[PDB]
């Protein structure tokens, strides 16, 4: 009757953070974790045999013990190696997947000085990653950005476009773009500067929704945008082989004033939660 | 050089109320609503030509203008409305998906008599739907549940399981198992009684949970229970031709208080966000 | 120099459940504990002389401990327990504050059958309390709800308003009404049937609400029903002496569909998050 | 029977952006917006009179109107402007209090130059007032941040403490302290600068918790902390009457590993969320 597509299971929403004392100097990296595996065998499915099971207390363990052992280097390399722990550390798991969330720590500064140990909470951007690896297989590396919050208030239009039946927007030379860019791109080799990689990325991102700093840059079209970043990406990065972006339009419309005897000649906009546009695209390296 | 492998677009977060009233017996539905469409030409992304372009707002139009022509049944059908819609009004949409949650409205209820127009914000789980649909081709609709928050405080247990450097968990007779289910299941056809389907999901799960009223049901694993659940989904339910559960652990732990001087008999507890069990399953039938 | 208008310290976030076995069916309530102490000295703040201080791993630890050695029958009375014990166990401690959040878990039950052991999560309105008591006085307790969405659909109105030069509504014999009740009450005494007292309340807020299952009550403004609310409360429940009630406006706006060529007459409604109408009011008895 | 404590009334949310071009930098602010009007008469509550209601819509409209009319230099400057109108545009207005929240826009910046039109969201702290007036007389002003996580690894303490039955804390010479700051004060004078005196109490917090960026500063009790920074506050900024400051204890325990044979020499921490140690204090100046 019956057949598995697929099984997994572990231990989410794992916190963690590892720090590197250095003279008074402290390195710290602090991320929330959750590592899935896959058994060669399923009879904890079928007939309630745990035998198999490594406990999900013991992902747990074992995720904070790597972490004393291997020490954290970046998000990126501690999830290769709780998958080269799972995947030689036993003969029964045939899969790992670990996804990880950085906490966004940024160390605190006052004109050039840096705290040797304070700490302040800036997420211009998220940092994840993930690592998927088949037993015995070179391991799969993601990483990418979340949230990051911008806002342009011109060099943007939407003219040219399709009206239908259901069309009531009209050409728009001119208006605000505000997005909260999604990024998520696959490493062809593991051999990666993981923390100058990423920082690359964001960079790319926000200098071609953004830049130059003084008249900015027209762009037509959000789809255009998304795509000239994709390729930017692709020329300063060769280990990245494959890139996705998604831009939620987050709107602010000039808010009508005549009814109430006013002109608002787009002074006073209103920013609207509900409804937004979403762009998304994926391209890769042509094989 | 580079190649598309995905490309999308559309409006999120696209909220409706629609109605449906007898006099003063009035019916309704509410629900979230998030359209994305596919386009045969790429000039939108390549050179920034709007040419092509359905304005995100016109998709907005579209979905409340379908809602006041087509009405709505069911999240699911009004799902199929607007794929069918924008791949029928078109002739270079490509592929359309639709993802929509209900707001989950109950009518107010007391001792069997229920109110005309008043409704209370009860939600047990919470509805959801996709539908998705290439041009030409057949659609593919999966509904699911989420959020459904369910606890047991004996009838569990946990024993015989994998001992490792890394393991501290002793073995357990009796335990509380508390989870927040998630599930989703792919249709083999389109017709469907939707509204029974997604409540007979619902109630199977719920009742394999628990057991009866009476004495329960003992379970050694939740990856049994998961799988005991989806079996028993398969055969109540013919037009379901995959489902997926995501089973939460979210922990229940007996505080020790010796060091107190006190002996907790199992009264008092922690209740734990972090970290938990996540147990998986996905199974489909064997064609 | 300066002077103190107000000190406090405490632990905030004790998660707690308790089990009461009574044969083979299970009594269970879940809470979120917070409390705050005031103490006789400063020298903390002043000299960071810790001497005087109840620590908060300790504080903690004692709310588990009461949870063992008291049980718990409300949140209520449980709330009360720890401020009289902060009281009387300890002497430069002048003030102790405790909120306490209930975890709203429903029984299961099939059909007037109930579960022995199972329980899913219903959060129809919130519970909530706070004692507050100073040394060598009567206790004050408030009880209230929280996050209580009702909607009703016709029996609503709003006409004959002030116009002025920044009005545009007009005037609507029949329109909905939705919000998300917040009350909080004061009892001029300890010795309450809390549990009875909550019920009440609630059946009331509903009631005048919704009114008659049948024919509903026509609403010709929110402060009226507001006010009504209170006064019904009051002589229901002697023992409550002041009750305040929030209610939002959270507006669905028949979608206006003429641009695009329809005639939406009252069939599809845009459920608007932001911004929302907000009515307040509480009323004590006449000393 | 009854008499009437507190009434109050209106629009919730206002979600606002105000630009301002000069050539070709812009500037911007966006903030939300809460209104609350209290009327002489109360015949609303009483009977369902409106003759005296100004609409929520209208509220809603008149802060609208208000941005464009008057400008947004800060968010206080705005309140009062909120403030002044019902005031004195009506008669029947005894009170109104408006509440604002910031989003917290910043512009975007490369290499010594600044972005004409750009801007990124980091909320290194969250800023927020209140303004409440009555009728013919002067307004009060409180401003206030919040969510500002800060984080040090090392220069905290917590030793000396009062030692009974439920405690099991021990001394401890070194640990970290995690915190959310949350301060509001009132101000003396409504004329103030708002920008500048914000920032000021901002920066004195931060100062205060880091210590010298070098050694830091040894910290025995946060309630010294609090009242130091409190002081500080009130010598740097004349015009700050009281000051509130609460600081979460959002705890990162070192993580026992002896029970799987290993020594966290201090490396691995395991931040908790709950639950939080809580410190309060408002201190202002003697008459």
Chains 1, 2, 3, 4 share one sequence.
Not at 12 to 31: A, D, Q, T, W
Not at 118 to 136: G, N, T, V
Not at 156 to 161: L, Q, Y
Not at 176 to 184: M, P
Request: hydrophobic residues 35%; glycine residues 4%; contains cysteine.
């Amino acid at each position: 009757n019956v057949e598995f597509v697929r099984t997994g299971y572990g231990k989410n929403m794992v916190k963690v953070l590892h720090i590197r004392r250095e003279g008074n100097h402290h390195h710290i990296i602090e991320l929330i974790a959750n590592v899935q595996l896959t058994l060669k065998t399923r009879k904890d499915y079928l007939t309630g045999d745990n035998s198999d099971i490594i406990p999900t207390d013991t992902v747990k363990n074992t995720v904070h013990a790597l972490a004393k052992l291997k020490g954290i280097k970046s998000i990126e390399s501690f999830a290769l190696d709780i998958c080269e722990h799972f995947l030689t550390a036993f003969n029964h798991v045939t899969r790992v997947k670990v996804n990880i969330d950085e906490v966004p720590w940024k160390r605190l500064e006052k004109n050039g000085v840096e705290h040797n140990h304070a700490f302040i909470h800036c997420p211009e951007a998220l940092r994840f990653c993930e690592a998927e690896q088949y037993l015995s297989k070179t391991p799969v590396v993601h990483s990418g950005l979340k949230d990051m919050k911008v806002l342009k208030t011109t060099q943007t239009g939407f003219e040219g476009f399709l009206r239908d039946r259901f069309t009531t927007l009209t050409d728009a030379k001119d208006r605000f773009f505000c997005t909260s860019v999604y990024a998520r791109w696959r490493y062809n080799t593991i051999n990666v500067a993981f923390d100058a990689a990423w920082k690359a990325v964001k960079d790319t991102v926000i200098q071609k929704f953004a830049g130059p700093y003084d008249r900015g840059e027209y762009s037509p079209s959000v789809q255009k945008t998304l795509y000239d970043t994709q390729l930017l990406v692709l020329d300063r990065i060769p280990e990245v082989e494959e890139i996705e972006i998604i831009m939620p339009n987050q709107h602010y419309f000039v808010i009508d004033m005549t009814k109430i005897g006013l002109s608002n000649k787009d002074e006073v906009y209103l920013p609207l939660d509900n409804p937004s546009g979403n762009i998304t695209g994926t391209v890769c390296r042509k094989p």
